């Protein structure tokens, strides 16, 4: 191929063919001249070498090289090696009618639709717009339609909205580990340049909103459109194919909202009140006359399919909080009332969705998930739950425990210095002492953090579960666990070594306090190892999955 400036670009096969032809012609010339046998034998060896390098370069004496010092690519090298036709172009190839962009949240969406930029939609659906413009007479020819879309006339946007009406688009994220990495959504034209992704599907994609990008493809044929609508739609794939559990469970902020709403405290506004139903509960809460955590009695009516699908109703006076009664207004008919009569952490919500799916069906569950998401977001916002430094309450008896551990380890060390215990025994003894100290510190921290005193209906002390923001996040399943809180407010703990051993002396400082420069080096020791192990695990898992799909 010619390039600009008289320069050319060529394949390596031209050089190999030229060499073969040159040596063949020289051999014919030598046979013509009746040369001595030595010369013709050498020429024949050279011809053999040239042909074998043409067919396959590497597997012989070294390998011929070009003008630069890289080996020439032979015919065989063009078929194999992960850069050949079999694996580089015949199974994975670039496609038209595709785009990519960053992703944002768009919490207002419904489970079956996604927000698509208007300019991306205009570029992707261009032939459809030309067809619509010509069909309705707004353009005489396809050239006129092209000019109209290029100038972005007013009618072009109406035509685009008509074209996009019911036409799914496949969204995909690069590490496609399972079949839920590609899903079909209905486009919703938006401004800007970022795709909006429904929160509930994020876990399916394993996607967050800190810089991730997604690719969008558009089906063309009627069969492709119907497959996207009936097979790949996001409202069809709500159960995991690995196990029958749901995979659209609310993740972190919905869980916090629903946990805060469904939760009781000892003494709140309007305790002991008797309500006529959920609507009166919501009216009282919004009027400011009652608290969202107020133990009242509410007249609840619940339906049951205790027949051949009849939904018989039962009305009673339940004992619940205002928040639970308010939340009951989104639950469908057939479900009982005991599902929403608890704290509703992370697992309770998943169990509730699973029960809804198994008792009622698919469409009610799809509506229920959206209602759950909206309510959780709304009430998490309304709670105003934040995080401060004073929320990380360190035990008041941590220093005493550390002093006790130090005294015991000093005793063990001086005992060893007197030749009563061997090195291994004393090392194990010190490890055990520090482990016990860490366990005691963690127990004290958690016991101090998981309860609070509130008074009262009459004026007496009464314990209750704490409303600490850190504890609420950890306990509801929204985010965090015991280890994170231990590191924040307990002691960072016991570290390891590059050898894999355990350092006898632990990091006795948490992150609310600071780690001195010597304690912060042992942490860097382990962070690097963590990152390297993550990379290695990704590579190994990919290789295993490829070998596993090859066989089956």
């Amino acid at each position: 191929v010619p390039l600009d400036g008289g320069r050319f670009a060529t394949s390596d096969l031209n050089d190999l063919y030229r060499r073969v032809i040159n040596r063949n012609n020289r051999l014919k010339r030598l046979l013509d001249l009746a040369a001595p046998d030595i010369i013709v034998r050498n020429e024949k060896r050279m011809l053999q070498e040239a042909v074998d390098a043409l067919l396959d370069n590497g597997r012989r004496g070294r390998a011929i090289t070009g003008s630069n010092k890289r080996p020439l690519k032979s015919l065989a090298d063009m078929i194999k090696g992960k850069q050949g036709r079999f694996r580089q172009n015949l199974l994975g190839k670039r496609v038209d009618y595709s785009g990519r962009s960053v992703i944002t949240v768009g919490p207002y969406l419904r489970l079956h639709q996604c927000g698509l930029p208007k300019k991306m939609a205009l570029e992707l659906f261009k032939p459809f717009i030309y067809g619509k413009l010509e069909l309705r007479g707004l353009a005489t020819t396809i050239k006129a339609a092209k000019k109209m879309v290029e100038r972005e006339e007013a009618v072009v946007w109406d035509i685009l909205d008509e074209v996009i009406r019911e036409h799914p688009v496949l969204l995909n994220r690069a590490p496609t580990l399972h079949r839920l990495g590609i899903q079909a959504f209905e486009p919703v034209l938006i401004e800007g340049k970022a795709i909006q992704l429904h929160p509930l599907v994020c876990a399916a994609y394993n996607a967050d909103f800190d810089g991730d990008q997604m690719a969008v493809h558009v089906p063309l044929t009627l069969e492709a459109q119907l497959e996207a609508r009936a097979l790949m739609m996001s409202t069809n794939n709500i159960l995991s194919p690995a196990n029958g559990e749901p995979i659209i469970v609310p993740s972190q902020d919905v869980v916090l909202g629903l946990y805060y709403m469904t939760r009781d405290c000892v003494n709140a506004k309007g305790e002991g009140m008797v309500l006529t139903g959920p609507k009166e509960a919501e009216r009282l809460y919004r009027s400011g006359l009652a608290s969202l955590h107020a133990r009242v009695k509410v007249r609840i009516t619940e339906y049951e399919k205790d027949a051949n699908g009849e939904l018989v109703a039962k009305t009673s006076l339940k004992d619940t909080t205002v928040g639970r009664a308010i939340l009951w207004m989104i639950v469908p008919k057939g479900l009982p009332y005991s599902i929403v009569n608890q704290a509703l952490g992370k697992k309770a919500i998943s169990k509730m969705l699973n029960t809804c799916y198994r008792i009622l069906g698919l469409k009610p569950t799809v509506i229920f998930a959206d209602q759950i998401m909206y309510t959780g977001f709304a009430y998490a916002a309304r709670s105003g739950a934040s995080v401060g430094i004073d929320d990380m309450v360190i035990p008041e008896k941590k220093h005493e425990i550390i002093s006790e551990a130090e005294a015991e380890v000093a005793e063990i060390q001086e005992q060893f210095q007197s030749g009563l215990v061997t090195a291994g025994e004393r090392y194990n003894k010190v490890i055990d002492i520090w482990a016990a100290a860490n366990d005691r510190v963690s127990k004290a921290m958690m016991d101090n953090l998981q309860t609070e005193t509130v008074i009262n209906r009459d004026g007496q002390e009464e314990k209750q579960v704490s409303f600490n923001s850190i504890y609420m996040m950890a306990d509801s399943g929204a985010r965090g666990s015991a280890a994170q809180i231990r590191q924040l407010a307990g002691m960072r703990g016991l570290m390891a070594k590059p050898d894999g051993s355990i350092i006898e002396t632990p990091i006795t400082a948490n992150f609310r306090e600071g780690l001195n420069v010597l304690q912060y080096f042992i942490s860097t020791h382990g962070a690097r190892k963590g990152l390297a192990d993550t990379a290695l695990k990704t590579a190994n898992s990919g290789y295993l999955t490829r070998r596993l799909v090859d066989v089956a």
Partner: protein, 1336 residues
Amino acid sequence: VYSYTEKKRIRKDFGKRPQVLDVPYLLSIQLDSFQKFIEQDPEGQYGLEAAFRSVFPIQSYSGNSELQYVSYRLGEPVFDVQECQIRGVTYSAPLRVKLRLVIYEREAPEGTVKDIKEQEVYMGEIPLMTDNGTFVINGTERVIVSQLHRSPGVFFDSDKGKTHSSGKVLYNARIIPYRGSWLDFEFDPKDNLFVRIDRRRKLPATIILRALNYTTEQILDLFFEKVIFEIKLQMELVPERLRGTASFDIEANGKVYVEKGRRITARHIRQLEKDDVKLIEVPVEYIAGKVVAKDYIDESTGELICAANMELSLDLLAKLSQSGHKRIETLFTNDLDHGPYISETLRVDPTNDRLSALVEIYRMMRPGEPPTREAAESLFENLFFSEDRYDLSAVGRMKFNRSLLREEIEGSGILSKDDIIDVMKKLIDIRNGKGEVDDIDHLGNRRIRSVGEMAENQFRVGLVRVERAVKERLSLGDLDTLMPQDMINAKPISAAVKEFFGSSQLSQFMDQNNPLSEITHKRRISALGPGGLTRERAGFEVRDVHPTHYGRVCPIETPEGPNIGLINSLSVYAQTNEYGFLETPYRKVTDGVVTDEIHYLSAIEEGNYVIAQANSNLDEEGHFVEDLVTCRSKGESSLFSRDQVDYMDVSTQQVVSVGASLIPFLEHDDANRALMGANMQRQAVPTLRADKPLVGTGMERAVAVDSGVTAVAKRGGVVQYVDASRIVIKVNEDEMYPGEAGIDIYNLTKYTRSNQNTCINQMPCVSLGEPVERGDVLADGPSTDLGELALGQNMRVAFMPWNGYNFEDSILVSERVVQEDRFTTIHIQELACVSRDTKLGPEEITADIPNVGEAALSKLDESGIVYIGAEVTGGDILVGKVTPKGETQLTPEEKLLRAIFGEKASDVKDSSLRVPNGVSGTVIDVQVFTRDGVEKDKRALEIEEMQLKQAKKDLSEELQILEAGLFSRIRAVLVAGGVEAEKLDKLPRDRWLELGLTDEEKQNQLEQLAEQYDELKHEFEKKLEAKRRKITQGDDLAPGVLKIVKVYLAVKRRIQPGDKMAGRHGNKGVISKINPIEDMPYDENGTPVDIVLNPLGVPSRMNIGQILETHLGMAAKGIGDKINAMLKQQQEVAKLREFIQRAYDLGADVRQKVDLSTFSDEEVMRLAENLRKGMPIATPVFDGAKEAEIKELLKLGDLPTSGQIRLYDGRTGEQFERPVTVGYMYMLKLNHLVDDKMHARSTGSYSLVTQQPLGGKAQFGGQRFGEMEVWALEAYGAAYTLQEMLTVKSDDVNGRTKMYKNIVDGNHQMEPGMPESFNVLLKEIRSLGINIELED
């Protein structure tokens, strides 16, 4: 004392710990290395002198002619830095060396010579380093990163018993030279000592001994001790030898010494030595398995009874006894300690003499050739022992001597025999349980190469090529009348230098995101590159942080990805040893006092000391406070008594790099989050207006100044003139250099493009008449604020969910942040239109274009080039160009169309530069380059005229400044008579020369100064001519291109949903919404919140330094608001003085102490004005501010010590429950903009061989549909979607073209066919000679 630039706005400093050592010049490694490279060194050991002395002199065959070297020099570059960058040429200097050819005659070689020819020869141009540590190679600034490589010397290691099933460690040694081969000794599983030369086939080790003219007896004498048997059958005994299970116990003094069976003990040895036991008798059976030491013959017949190193038997003993031999020598051995290793190899060694060993080595070296005695001798003697072919550099020799425990630092770069003998002896000693192996990750074993050495190596390579060429030329002929200039070809020398500087792995485009990115790129250590390990061959052994990294390499800042731990960053105080080893400073400790003298210790030298910690309490007299102090000994750390510590750390920052020292509250962040925070902080994009951090660490000023972005005063003075593009300083009289005028002019760098297409712009920060002093800043660069680094903006932030618009890491931003253009950036991009000459004819740049109806020609001038300053949007034409075309061959139904409408063909195709879609900026610069033959158009001449006017103006300024100094000199020599201190000044300045005093030194000096004045005038006329020639000369364009037009567009990007924003604590996110102001949460005063952040991100990612930063920023802004309220009521300066004084002294005995009693009222008011937006605060890395200090600072203002307030909902006005945390956080705008990431395609251009859509956004390519996506579509039942992906969308030509027509016809159906990739595969397989076919 406070600096004038630092007295405008003092940053309140916590950090109780004192400072003893100030941060050194940050980018001093690069400058030092390259300075050493190009430098006239009297005793050539650095740079070009070393290379010339190492290669030259060059001698021909028989020494008939000799080529000598005299000296070298570098001329001034033809183009300076700015011109080189403008016209895309390297900034380099020509290396001119004066050589001398001497020709010898017949007769006596050492004596008279026929003649000598000395001449200067030019050999290549060497690139020069800019005063900031960068190279301009092809108009782009490059950086050459140092390399961390294993130093030459001898290293002993083991395989840890993993390469064999038995799991037995196999020790080995290796001698690594600076250049040469690798002599490795190794232990075979059977304990046989083998040797390899270039990792090739193994050979018995002792063969090399036979190659060094050693006999078997000498070998055994060196590698073994001796035992003597005397005859009857009496043997001398050494008590120490029998340490330890004996066949025959003892026979000493006859009676008894010890019984049989019992193992010998220490008491037995003590008894034997006390009794003076020297000889004993042992049974002949005791000598059954011994090995004879030396050869034994028979005097009767001269027959070899037994050869050395042979098994000994009873019959041999009897033969020796009857042959008259009484003293028999055997080899002292011991299965445990002194195991037999050399003897077994000898018994397994095929060779018998030197010739056999040499032939074996030759056959192993270059197999297939017939060995020869002379050839083998030459090959072995040239493999090592030869200066030209083997070099063990001074560092290599030093490490070699130290490893073998020698006191000689210096020596020779060639291995001797003693060296190899000692290496083998030490390897054996290690095998015998005495000695330790070497660690390879130890920073005492790894060295640093810099630019001035990596360039020297390449230059010497080129010089060796030249040596070969010239020696070949002198081999034949040696004719006379041959100057020393027809033998030297410049191209071979310049080849290596050009290849290294231009196309190398360690030479890379600089990072110009901001000053921090430049600083951290210049001081970067890489383990990759030539002569270093590779990514796919580096395990976690080298990717981990070693205990020796403490104070030399940062453990936090390292890339995360394919190469983590292979690229690191130099620490803050780290320095390079004389040999290339990192060293770090420690403050010495005398008997009990911590003196203030710093010693720089290296990794190896640091092990054998006890080094205290920087955070160690010290009395005012220097004595330690605590009785026990925590110190880090050889390998670990523990408490040590006060009186056995000999060093102390010089600071609390010396463990971290500059990037990680800018994170406040670093010790409250998890290591992963700190790593991410540094890596992202390197990516911040400068914004329209700089905003200093309200919470910093005190390292901002150093990073700002030590970077070249600011303009720093060289000498103090008074600001004579200020302007948007220049500063004229009038120097003080104390530092005038009396021969000089005394004024300095700084020309600021206005809007200019960087490597990342951002904007570089310097603006002054001084006013008329403002005094300045040396080291003060005069013009802030990009991302600096009054000399402090300012990478982002202080935003009012709240932590709460707010309706799921910050769900995972999304960020909710206010419209008040977009209205005020706080995160708006300017980007500059150049577009080039190249007019070449094609076969059909030349391409014309013209305003007359076919098929354009004057709508797109509005912005084009009469020459077809867009007007400067024009606002252009996507699709507009910037430069109008047309290319000649050939016949078109109109089709039927188109011939008829033209016939009907009678429109002829244009005959020129429209190929004109146009703005890329989606871009909209203003043309800020247009520049045109024309070939020397082509004629300039109107626009080029206009640009040339403007340039000429500017050059004339600048040169006039320079001349006017220079003449003042000469006039001063004239006035100086007219003092001792004929001087009118009052009258003279009023008359014209040019009459100084007219007056004459007398025929004395004064008149002669006046005449000489007049001649100098005339010379200066002529010189500046010459310089004006030179500038004119430079402007008007033709350009060295590429072959075939007639001209080039470059147009620069300045886009101004705002912040929009999808843009990436992050803090300094590894907390990134993507903007999700631009909320209206009346919807944002607000407090009781009605002030909204700029940004809302999700609290759920804090617990899991344990980076709680952001909460502390938020609280401290709230405190600082509260202090600033109180100052602003005081200042806006026009209160007396006494109140402001009192408040600012009581706000500058808080905390538990901080080191900073500012006294406002020494501030004049104007200075106090200036400081208060600079503090009304918030008081800056400094929080050193591991010496920051305690929580109690934050609470007290909050209480100084009227803020709640909890850091939390009650917020109201903007939408409804109902207050949020459980108050929320609000404060101020420093947000950055990372260079990941959604404008550069949105790409969509429907159809475009396709590749050539395999007809598939091209790839990438620039190519308008498609999205790769990999194999895992195919598996995903197979997991569904989507067969038609997959098929249309595979055929109609990618590489089915007829199918893809029919699908388009079907779609535009409202028919959604496909007739796929077969992809072109399978056809290419079939043809390729048929070419292989196979017959693959499609049946029916």
